[PDB]
Amino acid sequence: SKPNVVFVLGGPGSGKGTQCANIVRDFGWVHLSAGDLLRQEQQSGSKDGEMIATMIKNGEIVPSIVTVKLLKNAIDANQGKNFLVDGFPRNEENNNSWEENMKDFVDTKFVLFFDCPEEVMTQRLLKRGESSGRSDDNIESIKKRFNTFNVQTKLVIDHYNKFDKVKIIPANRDVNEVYNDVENLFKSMGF
Numbered sequence: 462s463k464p465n466v467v468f469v470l471g472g473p474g475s476g477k478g479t480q481c482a483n484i485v486r487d488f489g490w491v492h493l494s495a496g497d498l499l500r501q502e503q504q505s506g507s508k509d510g511e512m513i514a515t516m517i518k519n520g521e522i523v524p525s526i527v528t529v530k531l532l533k534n535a536i537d538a539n540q541g542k543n544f545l546v547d548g549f550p551r552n553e554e555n556n557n558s559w560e561e562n563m564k565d566f567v568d569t570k571f572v573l574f575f576d577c578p579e580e581v582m583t584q585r586l587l588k589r590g591e592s593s594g595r596s597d598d599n600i601e602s603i604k605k606r607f608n609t610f611n612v613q614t615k616l617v618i619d620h621y622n623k624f625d626k627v628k629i630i631p632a633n634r635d636v637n638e639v640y641n642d643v644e645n646l647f648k649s650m651g652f
């Protein structure tokens with residue numbers, strides 16, 4: 462059987478990695494964070510590394526040929542699993558490249574959208590910034606990540622919503638309250 466795929470979207474610091482860890486724990490899906498895979502690719506000393514580094518710091522979206530390749534490598538290595546793909550698609554190019562490369566391999570089911578205010582997301586990330594040692598957890602970068610979300614990614618969420626394919630969870634609540642709804646949703650979808 463073809464894998465089920467759920468895209469996990471929402472702003473920087475909306476809690477995507479956090480909720481995805483919980484789903485992995487209770488449902489046994491594999492968690493693919495596109496941002497983390499792109500970091501890993503840079504730390505592994507490829508030709509694209511200096512490119513990826515710069516784009517991450519500036520909150521720009523890497524060319525899809527890089528990203529879709531890393532997601533596909535991991536997907537092909539885990540036959541018989543279902544996938545949470547987190548922080549992807551972030552723009553139209555991401556999306557077109559997914560449907561060009563993945564369409565008859567996967568059953569992409571819905572977009573799980575974590576809706577959260579910008580001011581709350583800012584505070585979360587400045588707190589993760591003390592200990593994360595990430596290049597994009599400073600105020601300069603966070604604001605660049607917001608704008609890219611606003612200009613590029615919001616259009617993608619709209620696209621999936623006109624096919625009734627977006628499920629929205631409000632994420633400005635306690636972590637366990639947010640997970641309660643996430644778990645209820647995944648159970649109701651038959652997973």
Ligand SMILES: Nc1ncnc2c1ncn2[C@@H]1O[C@H](COP(=O)(O)OP(=O)(O)O)[C@@H](O)[C@H]1O
Nearest residue numbers: 472473474475476477478479585589634635636
């Ligand atoms: N519901 C929440 N309330 C408060 N802190 C949270 C909540 N969800 C996540 N966090 C914290 O917010 C920060 C960002 O979480 P993360 O899952 O990495 O976000 P994303 O992947 O969407 O950028 C982390 O420090 C995390 O521990």
Ligand SMILES: Nc1ccn([C@@H]2O[C@H](COP(=O)(O)O)[C@@H](O)[C@H]2O)c(=O)n1
Nearest residue numbers: 495496516517520521522523548549551
């Ligand atoms: N689909 C994706 C996902 C992440 N990214 C890059 O990785 C950065 C970090 O992503 P996360 O916030 O999701 O960890 C993004 O802000 C962006 O610069 C990307 O270029 N393409």
Ligand SMILES: [Mg+2]
Nearest residue numbers: 477478494496
């Ligand atoms: Mg993340």
